Structures are given as C-alpha cells and as structure tokens.
Amino acid sequence: TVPQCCYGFCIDLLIKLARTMQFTYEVHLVADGKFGTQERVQNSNKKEWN
C-alpha cells in the first residue's frame, strides 16, 4: 500500500456530511478493485460477497 491523494464529488459530499454531523473518518481504497458481486460457487460450499 502507498499513501495517495483523493478528491472529487464524493469526497466533497463526505466532508460536508462529516461537518454537518460532526464525526471523523479514515478513508482507504479497496484492494479488490471490484464494485461487488456475490460469488455463490458450489465448489467451496460457501457463498460470499467480493
């Protein structure tokens, strides 16, 4: 992992929310880089989201 810089529309909305309801945050990216899908392959007998 490496520290990078993030900004944009979602970041501005996040800052607005954190200001309006007074909480703190530690944003970090996702490792998989995928939006999300529920892998339910019967090979491992388990189903989970990615």
Binding site: R40, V41, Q42, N45
Partner: protein
C-alpha cells in the same frame, strides 16, 4: 508379522473366505500378516467382548474385521466403544457393523464401509435433476439425523446456480397424543408434486397411512426416502405407495468374501507401510480388564495413517468423520408386486440408469421432429 482376526456370525461360507484370505499377496508390503478365522453366534455384546479379549490375549492380535448377520446397531455401537477403550484398530465389514453411527468418539479408531448422510442427499438431488424434476418439499420426524440431513440439503440447494423452488418444510412430531388430527390437517397444505420424507419404518408407515387417508399419494405424488426407511428389501409393510423411490447400499453385486479379503489386504498394507516409515509398531498388553493404564502408548499415528490406503487399483481412503470417500450406491423402485427392483447405480459422483425413458406409472404423446 501382525495377527489379524476375522470373526463371522451365523451361517456363512467360511471355506470360501479361507481361499480368498490365503490368496492375498502382500510381498512388497512385507507385512506377512497371519489370519485368525473365528466363528461365533449372536449371544450378546458381553460374549463378543469376551471373545475379543481372548483373541487379543491369544497371540499378538493387532486388528479385527467383524461381521454379523443381524440388524441391531447396538452391536456396532458396542464394537466402536470397545475399539475406543482398548485403543486397537477394528473395522466394520458388513451387516450390523456396517450401520453408520452419527457422532463418533474423539479418541477413537474406527473404520466402516458406507456413505454419509450428505452423500445420500447428493445422490437423491442428482437423481431428481436427471429425472427433470425441479420442485419438492421436505418432511421429517423428531429424529435429529433427519434435521441434520434437512439442514445439509438446504445448505447445498441454497448455493445453486440453477433454479430451485422450495414450498415449505414440516417438522411434525408423531409422539404427541391425540395430535394425529393436527398432523392430518397440516399435511393437506402440501402442494408440490415431489416430497422427501425422513423418518423411521414405523413412522413412515404411519405417515403413509395418514397420507392415504388424505389421498395425496395416488397419481401426481412422488415420494423419496433415505436408505434407513426400507432397511430390509425382503419385507414390505404393504402401506407404502406404489412407485416409491429410495437409495440403498450396494449389497446385491458386492461380494462378501472378496470385500473381506480386500479390507484385510488394505489394512495389512497400511500397517506395513506405517511400521516401515514411522518405525513404531503398537503391541501393548492385550488385556480387557484394567485398561486405564494401557493408554501409555499412544496409537494416534495408526489412526492418522489409516485414512489413506490403496491396493489392487482401488481407492479406500476414509474421511475425518469415519465414512468412506467413494462408496457404491444403488437406486431401486417398487413394482406392482411388492418388491425392490434395481434401477440404477451411482459411484464416484457418476450415475448410470438402466433406461433412457422413465417408466410412467392416452396421454404422454411422442412427437417426431427434424
């Protein structure tokens, strides 16, 4: 030079098994195992314990293959308990010892030949998928094994890429007094054309009588039962609906003396390989009484090595729960005259039926197409 015992019960062709035992060749394993063939009656578990103690204290008995012609599971339970107490490895060939007990002891050394509860459910699901059926419901008695099998089947069918439709699940208890009316009222809620039943023989007969009183067993109903619902194919309660489908263990084709010889040879080869590799052979004081201090020599290595063996081009590796990895199962059907006729055979997750078209029991047209 490990002495293995083979005990028979009732009438059996011991002379035929003697030739199979003598024909065993394990020169590469260098076990040189001696065979002790003994016959006994169905007296009791105490007589069985006394015979086992005598055979152990006779000449360095390091293994036993026990078969019986009865049908009680208490004999298998007592055998498993004696094997766990004496810490010696024993095997179940067939008959009453072949019964699959649910929860094995932690510090036990037992091995049997047969399929698991999940294996029967998987075979039934494969047969239903082959029969093009895609909807069914479940009904079970107060047996805990039935609940475990239902949970396993639900977990297996839940994570399926193909479609599936489950109507409902019933957990009616037959032990209640005057509750048969409620059970009959609740059985009318069933609407699917296929239903699985998990109960005992008497409970299955009672439920079948109740359903016949309701009437949902004549034309558009199909019932699937486990291997424990039939038990004996010779006897029929005459209360089961015609066309019942159930799985069972391969007992018509498998040969008893050949299976006993194969098991003895596999056990001898595994023991020889373990004694050659680990260089530790367990030969404690073979006594029955005062066995509390006999646990000084741990025999967990033999149990760990007994779950991986192969001989004569066959795979006999067991599982952590004490069940064979690849068993041979059969699927039979009921004809007009009360009897069981072998229809299909399943092995190594591969099924094989004796007919491309199912026997239906003028509709059902046939159409030709280019």
């Amino acid at each position: 030079s490990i002495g293995i015992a083979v005990i028979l019960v009732g009438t059996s062709d011991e002379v035929a098994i003697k030739d199979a035992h003598e024909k065993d060749d394990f020169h590469h394993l260098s076990v040189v195992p001696r065979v002790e063939l003994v016959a006994m009656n169905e007296t009791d578990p105490k007589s069985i314990i006394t015979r086992i103690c005598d055979l152990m204290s006779d000449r360095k008995i390091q293994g036993v293959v026990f078969a019986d012609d009865t049908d009680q599971e208490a004999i298998a339970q007592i055998l498993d308990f004696i094997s766990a107490q004496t810490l010696t490895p024993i095997l179940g060939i067939h008959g009453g010892s072949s019964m699959i007990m649910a929860d094995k002891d932690e510090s036990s050394m037992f091995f049997q030949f047969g399929p698991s509860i999940e294996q029967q459910a998987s075979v039934m699901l494969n047969i239903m998928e082959e029969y093009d059926w895609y909807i069914f419901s479940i009904v079970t008695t107060y047996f805990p094994g039935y609940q475990d099998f239902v949970n396993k089947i639900r977990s297996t069918i839940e994570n399926s890429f193909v479609g599936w439709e489950l109507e409902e699940v019933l957990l009616l208890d037959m032990s209640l007094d005057d509750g048969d009316s409620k059970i009959q009222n609740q059985l009318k809620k069933l609407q699917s054309p296929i239903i699985l039943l998990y109960c005992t023989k008497e409970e299955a007969t009672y439920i079948f009588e109740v359903a016949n009183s309701v009437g949902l067993t004549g034309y558009g109903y199909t019932w699937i039962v486990p291997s424990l619902v039939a038990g004996d194919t010779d006897t029929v309660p005459s209360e089961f609906p015609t066309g019942l489908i159930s799985v069972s263990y391969d007992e018509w084709d498998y040969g008893l003396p050949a299976r006993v010889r194969d098991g003895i040879a596999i056990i001898t080869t595994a023991a020889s390989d373990m004694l050659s590799e680990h260089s530790f052979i367990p030969e404690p004081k073979s006594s029955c009484y005062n066995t509390h201090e006999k646990r000084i020599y741990q025999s967990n290595m033999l149990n760990r090595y007994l779950i991986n063996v192969t001989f004569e081009g066959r795979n006999l590796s067991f599982s952590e729960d004490g069940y064979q990895m690849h068993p041979k199962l059969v699927i039979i059907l009921l004809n007009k005259e009360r009897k069981w006729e072998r229809v299909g055979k399943w092995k190594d997750k591969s099924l094989q039926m004796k007919y491309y078209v199912w026997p239906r029991m003028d509709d059902h047209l046939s159409i030709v197409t280019l």
